[PDB]
Amino acid sequence: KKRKRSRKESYSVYVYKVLKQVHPDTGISSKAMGIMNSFVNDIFERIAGEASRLAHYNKRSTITSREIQTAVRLLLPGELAKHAVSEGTKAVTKYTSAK
Amino acid sequence: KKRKRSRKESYSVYVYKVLKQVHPDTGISSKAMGIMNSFVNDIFERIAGEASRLAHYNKRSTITSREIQTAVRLLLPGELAKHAVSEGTKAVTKYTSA
Amino acid sequence: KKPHRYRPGTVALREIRRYQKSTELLIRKLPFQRLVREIAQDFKTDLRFQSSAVMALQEACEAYLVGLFEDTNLCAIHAKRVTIMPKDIQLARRIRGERA
Amino acid sequence: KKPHRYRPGTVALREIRRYQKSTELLIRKLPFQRLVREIAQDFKTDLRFQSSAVMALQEACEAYLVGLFEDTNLCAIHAKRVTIMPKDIQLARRIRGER
Amino acid sequence: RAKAKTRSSRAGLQFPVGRVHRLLRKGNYSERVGAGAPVYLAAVLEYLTAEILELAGNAARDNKKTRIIPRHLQLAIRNDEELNKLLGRVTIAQGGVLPNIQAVLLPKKTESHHKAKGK
Amino acid sequence: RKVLRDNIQGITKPAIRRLARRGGVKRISGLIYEETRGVLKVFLENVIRDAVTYTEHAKRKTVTAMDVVYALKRQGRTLYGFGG
Amino acid sequence: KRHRKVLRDNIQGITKPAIRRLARRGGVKRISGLIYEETRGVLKVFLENVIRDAVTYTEHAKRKTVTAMDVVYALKRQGRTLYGFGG
Amino acid sequence: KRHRKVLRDNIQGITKPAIRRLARRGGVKRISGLIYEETRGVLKVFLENVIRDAVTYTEHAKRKTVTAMDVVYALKRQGRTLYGFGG
DNA sequence: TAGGGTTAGGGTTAGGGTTAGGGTTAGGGTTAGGGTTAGGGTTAGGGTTAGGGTTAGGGTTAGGGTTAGGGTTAGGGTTAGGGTTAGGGTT
DNA sequence: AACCCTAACCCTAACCCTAACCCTAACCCTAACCCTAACCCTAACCCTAACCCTAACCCTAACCCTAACCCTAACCCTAACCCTAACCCTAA
Fold this sequence. Notes:
This is part of a larger assembly, with two copies of chain A, two copies of chain C, one copy of chain E and three copies of chain F.
Chain A: H1 19-22, H2 30-40, H3 54-57, H4 65-75, H5 82-97
Chain C: H1 15-19, H2 35-38, E1 48-49, H3 65-76, E2 83-84, H4 86-96
Helix pairs in contact in C: 3-4
Chain F: H1 6-9, H2 18-21, E1 27-28, H3 32-58, E2 62-63, H4 65-74, E3 79-80
Chain C binds a DNA duplex through residues 3, 5-9, 11-12, 28-31, 48-51, 80-83.
Main location (chain D): nucleus
GO biological process, one term (chain D): nucleosome assembly
Organism (chain D): Homo sapiens (Human)
């Protein structure tokens, strides 16, 4: 009775904060949170599945940024991988340069 | 020579023994070994591969015998499944005895 | 009676428009909760389906049939006909890679 | 004088039977070696191709092409026609899903 | 434990950069994750969630509603050419279909008169 | 529940035309209605058999929604939504 | 210093006889005249796509040579597994 | 010898400062960052269009050298009329 | 870089296969009335689960030996060229 | 039946070879453990079944208008020899 409650984990708080930068004024109905939380879990299982084959073919044992970047160049198409390799490079540059 | 080549591994010795058991007077050319050696290394990634996912969904952390019997009932067709799920258990039974 | 008897072909081009702008499900729910349970009795006896897995089979067997029908229509307009016929559905499957 | 001109379309049935019973590649190696070299220049320059890489590319490319022509033929026999044409190739690619 | 600063904030990314490290490590994708990989992979997911969630809102104003419901998601992933060549096999839960009637069958056109007795 | 013929007759003639009119077809021949009951029975046999194989692995006797979302994913037609 | 021609073979070598030899294996009996320009447009969008993924693997190892195992690895992703040309 | 030919890096040959000196003669005060790629698109279409008409006159005379009274005879048709570098 | 043989590359020509037109008839379309079944509710009781301590055997793991698999190599056993003979009809 | 193609060899002669032979490297027995898939009440919820209804939806005729099909020619275009002699092989 007391507690005995499992904690389901979902990326739904973080998809209600990217709707509040791109378009303040609009809100997502419960089904759209469904058809979204099942998108984030599908482009994270296609970039950690072409980066665990690239590490092994080259006989190396760690997924460094270059490997998570070769996948974006192959799996995403044009005018989508171009606007994504740059977005990552600025975001990691801040991590090392700025502490 | 002085290279100390790392060298490679091939399931080519094993294929020759099986050819002798089924037909005892034919032989295989090297190009034919290449198509066959690849198949033995491509039905080891589909059958093992479905087993890895079947472990995670359940939450269990080991790939034991049942998980390679629910991956041969899904990734193999119709009557090459009943004749391969049955063939495998017989070899597991013998190993347990000895 | 001088009414508005619509000529063959004007109550079918107003139907394609109404049904292509909606999100509901065409197949009735109760007759599709018995096709699913008579194709399960053979595989294992006494299987009890959940109430959200008899609506995830309806929404994947009503979105593959509205997929064969668009491919049948492109094929039946390649022989100069406007009526889909049973020798069209069979061609669509072969090229797609399904029954042969 | 013996013209011995077989009527139109009967030399080809002999051609189909002889061609379907052998495995030698039908596009010449020296010209194909160059088409890959031109299509590689844009992705990077200074790329050196090993002998096997051109050979594999010839076996896959012949195999995609041999197939598109068995499906174009199936489409042609449907309209009551007996010859492939430019329009038939585009129905096979829309249906197969390549677009 | 002197003070708490989220690893997402130091790199200025909204999507979690701590959760993606556990999920990469506990899924048995590879032996040693590295530390430049959780941050790169929490930014190639956020750009994509900001392409569908902005090409879908713009299709909600057009139909005069203030919520991005399931259909407005199909009218935004079945138009863009880059996003219809990635999610090209996926089926949205209650999406519907994109309007298209082939021109040859449009009403009359060739004109249904047939014998047209007269001329 | 039943084992009769109402299973494949449940997909009645009106609802095997409305599914089509959502695709563009303007005139439907009489024999399309029989062939399109055959194609749906084969698809359901293949999706339902794979859900049962996953259900037996965990020993459960209920075919939950996630199992159908994992049967469809293998054959190349992922579903997004009715599950996670 | 430079081959005077810089055409890099402009979709050439697929001469009328080669496209009339591949089609005959297929089953085609009466090839029409316009097919030859089109079949040099379909080969073209294929040889590029295996190649873009092939270079992408080699630059990952930093090597400058496209070995056949790279072409067999690229061909699996698109959908057709060539068996043995490289192994 | 000269074992190299002109690649396609030339379109980026116009530097970032040169597009900031042909725009400060225009009255522009605060050039935005994305303009540099667009101004390499407008120049790129123009240089081809004067060029195709220039080659088409030279091939009429069966020569192999594009002399300036050919550029001046192409530039009149499109719209401008350079007076000076030509007769 | 020779060099050489054959593959592609040009012409004609006649047949046959699209292609446009012109009738003929069943076959979908389009309304209009009868006869339901497929949806909703409410109860209720059994039918399958969700944690939770608790063993014990099945793994891992880090030492030895040692066996089995992976390179190199003459000389024979197919196996194709290579010409006759065969053999199918085939215009 | 103009006179065209199909089917025995048979020499010909390189690549599959069994060794065979080291020997290098990877498995196996032998000792340690830990940890988890077994185990169990329970208490909870949720699927199944039963009951009632009723009103939108299917069903089954009639009438008649198109569209699918089968001829009809015919006329453009794709087929099948023929001197090349250019270019791709083939070493080296």
